[PDB]
Design a protein around this ligand. Structure first.
Ligand code: A1BB4
Ligand code: A1BB4
Lengths: 103, 109, 148, 87, 92, 104, 89, 150, 151, 89, 104
C-alpha cells in the first residue's frame, strides 16, 4: 500500500512495499534486484537516515503520500570500505518552459 | 387407472403455491452424480418426478398405493438430504400434502 | 421466511464498502442461519461469486452494528443481465443520536465498568444490549409479516 | 419556522422547527417556540443540534453517509442528553 | 523479474517486466527469440518523461480491474505534450 | 450456537431449538404459534427466575453445554389470568421403578 | 408440530419430522392427517426421553465434526428399550 | 472378495484419531478380505500409523464390538499422500438407533445369563443376545457395495 | 509460483474440522498463488466443503491472523477422493514458541496504539507491532521448500 | 537427567534436563556440564510458568491429537514475555 | 493416560509426569531419586489429605484433565525428622505486580 522510487545516482527503482514492512525488508528487496547485500545499503527519506528496524510507516511513508502515480522517493547510498557514499540522486531531465499555447 | 395416475402425478407437478411459483421445477429431473455426489451417497433410492411418469407410462406402479410409496420416498429423500427449513425441504412437505389431496379427489369422486 | 434459495444460476456481485468501518458480509444460508464471511476493509471493493436469490446482510465486524446496502437492510442479487455484475453499495445508516452515543461509550468503557458510569439504570441495560444479527433478523421478519 | 432551545448555563440555540422535531421529547413539548433544559449544558445541547442538522441532511441520501463523530470528553453527557431527548 | 528502461539523457529505470509490457512497443522489443532482453534504450525520450511513463505502468497495473473507485491519472501541463508524444510511440 | 429446550407448563411439554443469540421474546412467539396465546400473556422462567423478553437465551444461562439435544434445558411457562398470572406449575414426569437387583 | 401423549397423560409437542424418525409413529399418522397419537403403555419419563432421542438423531445425523454418546441411565434403560422396540426408534 | 485391501507396495502414513468415547479396535482387512485386529486406540488419542495405499480399514468399540465411523463413513482407505502430508482418519460414534443404543446399555448392565429375567418380548431377548459382529456387518456392506449406489 | 492450486476439474469433497479454540479462517491459494479468504469456522465445528484435487489450502486465527496447523502440517492439499469418501482436514493450534505465545496474549490485552506505552525493550515493541501475516509466512514457506529441493 | 533452575526470590525448580534444553539460553549455559543455573532477574511466579511451558512443549510437539491453548494470565503476560525472550524458549 | 505434577516441599518444586495407573509409592521413589530421601522418610499430600503408598494417582484424584502439562496438579511433600514428620509447608511463589494501566 506504499509506492516508492528508490534512487541512487542515475538509477531509479519503482516498487511497492507495505506501510507495516520495515526499512530492512526494503534493503533485502534491493539485494534481490541489484545483487548488493543489505548491510552496505543506506536508505534516506529526504535528508534523514532510516533505521533498518523502523516500519516505512514510522519513517513517514504513507499510502496517501506514496500513491502509484506520485511515488514517494527513498534515497540510496552504498558503502565503499569504511566510508559512506554521499546521498547523491542526480536529477531527471528538465521540462521545456510552459508553451505560450497553454497560458 | 393410468389416466388417474397421470391426473394425480400431473396435478402435483402443475401445482403452483400462492406466489405463482411451481414447486416441482426442482423435483422434475435429478442431478448427475458428477454434479452432486453427496446426494447420491446420502440417498439410498434416487427417484424423481419423470422416473415416476416413466413408471406410469410403463404402468410399473400396480395400485395407487404403490405410486404413493415412491412419491413419499423422493419427498422424504429430499427432506433427509436438505437442511430443515430450506426452500426444497418445505415443498417436499407440501408435495406430499398436494399428492395426498390429489389421490383423495381422483380415486373417490 | 428470510433465507437464500438454492438456485444453480451464478450472480457475480461487487461488495463496495463505503463505510468508515470494517464490514462483515453475512450470507443467510438455505435454512436461514447467518454465516459470517471474510471482512471488507473501509473503502475497498471486491467482486464475489454468489448465486441468484441468495440473501446477504452487512455489519461492522468489530461492534456488530447494523449497516445498509443500496439504502436497505438486505441485499439479494437479481439475475445478471448480459453478464454485467450487480453492485452492493455498503454504507453507514443514520443511527439515532442515542444508539450512536451507545456505540461510542461501548467502544471506550469495558462492559464490567458500564456499572461505574453515573447514568440511569435503563441506560446501563441499553449499553449491555449489544447489537446482534439474530435479534435484527427476528425484527426484520415481523416487519415483513406486518407488510403482509 | 425556527425554535429556541436553552441550555442549563443559559445559552440560546435557534434551530429550524423540523430539525428539532427529530426529538420525540421536543415533539411532545411543542404539542410555543421555546424549551428550557435545566440539566443539559451548552457543549452538549450545541452537539445535540449538530445531530439534528446531520440527521435531517443525510437521511435518505443514497451514495454515502459520514460517521457522526462524538469525542470521548462529551460522550457520556451526550448519551444522557440523547436518551432524555429520544433523538 | 524486472526490466531496465534507459532515457535519452541516460537515466536507468528498473520496473517489473509485467509493468513494462503494458506498452505494445516494449512488448514487441522484448518478446533473438531464444531468451529475454533486460535493457531497452529510448534515444528520443528524456528522463522527466520516461519516469512518468513508468508511473503510468504502476497506475495501470494497480487500478485495472479494481472494483469500487479509480483515481484520475494526473499529468502536469509542463509534461503533457512530450508525454503524449512518448505515449503514442510506446502504444501504452 | 444451537440451544435445545423443553418449554413446559403443567402437563404440556414443547420440544424446540433456538439460537444462543435468539431472544426470550421470539421463544414466547414460538409458544404463541403452538398454544395460541400472545407473548404479553406468557411468562417464561429458567428454574424460578423470570426471563426478560429482551435478553438472549445465552445471557439467560442456556449455553450449548447445558441445552444439548439429548439433555434439553427446561424453560418454565405461565399464562395470564386477567389481572394476575398463574403460579409456575410443572407437573413432574412419571417415576422410574426402583433399580432392579439384576443391574446392581 | 405433532402431539405425543403418554400413559399418565403428559402431552409432548415435537416437530412432525422429528417424530417421523419412529416408523411406528409414521404408520399411525400416515394411516387415516391428525396431530395427536396416544401411547397407553408408555409412561412420561420414557416418552420424554424418546423425544430427546428424536432431537439428538435429527441434529447429529450427517454431522462432520464428532457425535456425543446418547446417554441412558440404568433406572430408565429397560422401559426405554421396550418403548424403543415398540417404536421403530 | 469384493471388500479387501489391495497390494500396493506404496506406503501411506495415516493418523488414527479416536474422537469416540469408546476404546477403538482398528480392524485392517487383509488382501483375502479377512478382518485383522490391531492394537486399541484409547479414547481421545491420536497416533501416526504406517499403512499402504488402497489398504482398507474399519473401526469398532474394542469391548462391545459396536460399530464406529471414520470420516463419516464405515470404511477408511488411505489416499496416496501428497507431499508426505499424513492422511487423517477421524473415528467417531455413529447415530445409533435408540433400540440398538438401549441394547448396548442393557447388555452393559445385565449379565447375559440374566437377560432371561427381564420382563421383555422373546424377540427383544434374542436381540439382546445377538452381540454386534464385524463379519455380519462386512457381509451387509458387500451387498450394499455390490449395489453400485446406496 | 511454487505454492499454488492446480486447475484440475476433478472435484474433491473435504471436511474442515476446527479443533482449535479459535475462530478459523480457511485461506485458499488460487492458481497464481494469491491467498483468498473463505468463510470462518467457529471453534469445535466441522463442515463439508467442495474443493478440487491439487487445490492448496491454509488456515489461520480469523482475528489475530496467528498460524494454525492442518493434519499436523502448515498446508493442506486434498488427496484424490476414493469411493466417494470425503478427505479430512483436522485444524489445530500448533505449539507456539513461549515468546510468540506471550506476544499473542499482550497483543490481545493492549490496543495497538498503546504497544508504545509498555515499559519493555524497543525490540519487544517491534515484535508486538509485527502482526502475524499470511504473505510473510508464505514467503518463508517457499524458501523452506527450495531448501529441501536444493541438497 | 534432572536440572535445577533457581528464581530471583530463590525458589528451586527441578525439571528434566531435556525439558530445560528447550531454551537456547539454558542450552548455552549448560553446554563437563553443571546441575544448577541461577536467574537473578526472573521471579518464581514467572520461572514456574516457564517450566510449565517446557512440560507443554515437550509433550505436545509432534502430537497427531488436537493441541490445547497454553494459557497466560494478564498479570503474568509482560514479565513472561521478557523472560521468554531472554530464555529463547 | 498421563498426569503432570508439581511435587513441592518448601522452596523446592519438582516437575515430573507419571501414569494415572502408577502409584503414590512409585512417585516417592522418583523423589528419592532426586532429593536422596527414601519412601519411608516421605509423606505425599494432595491438598491437605495424606496419600497411601498403595493407591494409584488416579484413585487419589490426579486425572488427565486436572493434571495437564500447562496446569500441573500439586502434590505436597513432607520429610521425617527423627521421630516426627515436619508440617506440610509449601512456600508460595512470588506475587505479580499490579496490572500496568494499559491492560486494566
Ligand atoms: C472473498 C470474500 N470477501 C467477502 S465475501 C467473500 C467470499 C464470498 C463467497 C465465497 C465463496 C467462493 N462463495 C460462496 O460462499 C457463495 C456465497 C453465497 O452466494 C453462497 N455461496 C456458496 O458457495 C454456497 C453455495 C454454492 C452453491 O452452488 C449451487 C448452485 C450448487 N448446487 C448443486 C447444483 C444445484 N443443486 C442441484 C441439486 N438440487 C437438489 C435437487 C434435489 C432433488 C430434486 C429432485 C428429486 C429429488 C431431489 O432430492 N434435492 N436436493 C437438491 N439440493 C441441491 C439442489 C440444487 C446447486 N449453492 O450454494 C455454499 C457455500 C453452500 C468466497 C469468498
Ligand atoms: C500402533 C498401532 N495402533 C493402532 S494400529 C497400530 C499399528 C498399525 C500398523 C502397524 C504396522 C507397522 N503396519 C502394518 O501392520 C500395516 C498396516 C496395514 O496397512 C497392513 N500392514 C502390514 O504390515 C501388512 C503388509 C502388507 C504389505 O504389503 C506388502 C508390500 C508386504 N509383503 C511383500 C510382498 C506382499 N505379498 C503380496 C502378495 N504376494 C502374492 C500374490 C499372489 C497373487 C496376487 C494376485 C493374483 C494372483 C496371485 O497369485 N500370489 N502369490 C503371492 N505370494 C507372495 C505375496 C507377497 C507382502 N506390507 O505389509 C502385513 C501385516 C501383511 C503397527 C501398529
Amino acid at each position: 500500500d506504499v509506492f516508492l522510487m528508490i534512487r541512487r545516482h542515475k538509477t531509479t527503482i519503482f516498487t511497492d512495499a507495505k506501510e507495516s514492512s520495515t526499512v530492512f525488508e526494503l534493503k533485502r528487496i534491493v539485494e534481490g534486484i541489484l545483487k548488493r547485500p543489505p548491510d552496505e545499503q543506506r536508505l534516506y527519506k529526504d535528508d534523514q537516515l532510516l533505521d533498518d528496524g523502523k516500519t516505512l510507516g514510522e519513517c513517514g511513508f504513507t499510502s496517501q503520500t506514496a500513491r502509484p502515480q506520485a511515488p514517494a522517493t527513498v534515497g540510496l547510498a552504498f558503502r565503499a570500505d569504511d566510508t559512506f557514499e554521499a546521498l547523491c540522486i542526480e536529477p531527471f531531465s528538465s521540462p521545456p518552459e510552459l508553451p505560450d499555447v497553454m497560458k | 387407472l393410468t389416466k388417474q395416475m397421470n391426473a394425480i402425478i400431473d396435478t402435483v407437478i402443475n401445482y403452483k403455491d400462492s406466489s405463482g411459483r411451481q414447486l416441482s421445477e426442482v423435483f422434475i429431473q435429478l442431478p448427475s452424480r458428477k454434479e452432486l455426489p453427496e446426494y447420491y451417497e446420502l440417498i439410498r433410492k434416487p427417484v424423481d418426478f419423470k422416473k415416476i411418469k416413466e413408471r406410469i407410462r410403463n404402468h410399473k406402479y400396480r395400485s395407487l398405493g404403490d405410486l404413493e410409496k415412491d412419491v413419499m420416498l423422493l419427498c422424504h429423500n429430499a427432506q433427509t438430504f436438505n437442511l430443515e427449513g430450506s426452500q426444497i425441504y418445505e415443498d417436499s412437505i407440501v408435495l406430499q400434502s398436494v399428492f395426498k389431496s390429489a389421490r383423495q379427489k381422483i380415486a373417490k369422486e | 421466511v428470510l433465507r437464500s434459495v438454492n438456485s444453480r444460476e451464478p450472480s457475480q456481485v461487487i461488495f463496495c464498502n463505503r463505510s468508515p468501518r470494517v464490514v462483515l458480509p453475512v450470507w443467510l444460508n438455505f435454512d436461514g442461519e447467518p454465516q459470517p464471511y471474510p471482512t471488507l476493509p473501509p473503502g475497498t471493493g471486491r467482486r464475489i461469486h454468489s448465486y441468484r436469490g441468495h440473501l446477504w446482510l452487512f455489519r461492522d465486524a468489530g461492534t456488530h452494528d447494523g449497516l445498509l446496502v443500496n439504502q436497505t437492510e438486505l441485499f439479494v442479487p437479481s439475475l445478471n443481465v448480459d453478464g454485467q455484475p450487480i453492485f452492493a453499495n455498503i454504507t453507514l445508516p443514520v443511527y439515532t443520536l442515542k444508539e450512536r452515543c451507545l456505540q461510542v461509550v461501548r467502544s471506550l468503557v469495558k462492559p464490567e465498568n458500564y456499572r461505574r458510569l453515573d447514568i440511569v439504570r435503563s441506560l446501563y441495560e441499553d449499553l449491555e444490549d449489544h447489537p446482534n444479527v439474530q435479534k435484527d433478523l427476528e425484527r426484520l421478519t415481523q416487519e415483513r409479516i406486518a407488510h403482509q | 419556522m425556527y425554535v429556541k432551545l436553552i441550555s442549563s448555563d443559559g445559552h440560546e440555540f435557534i434551530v429550524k422547527r423540523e430539525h428539532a422535531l427529530t426529538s420525540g421529547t421536543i415533539k411532545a413539548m411543542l404539542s410555543t417556540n421555546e424549551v428550557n433544559f435545566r440539566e443539559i449544558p451548552s457543549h452538549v445541547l450545541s452537539k445535540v443540534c449538530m445531530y439534528f442538522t446531520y440527521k435531517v441532511r443525510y437521511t435518505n441520501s443514497s451514495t454515502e453517509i459520514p460517521e457522526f463523530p462524538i469525542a470521548p470528553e462529551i460522550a457520556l453527557e451526550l448519551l444522557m442528553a440523547a436518551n432524555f431527548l429520544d433523538c
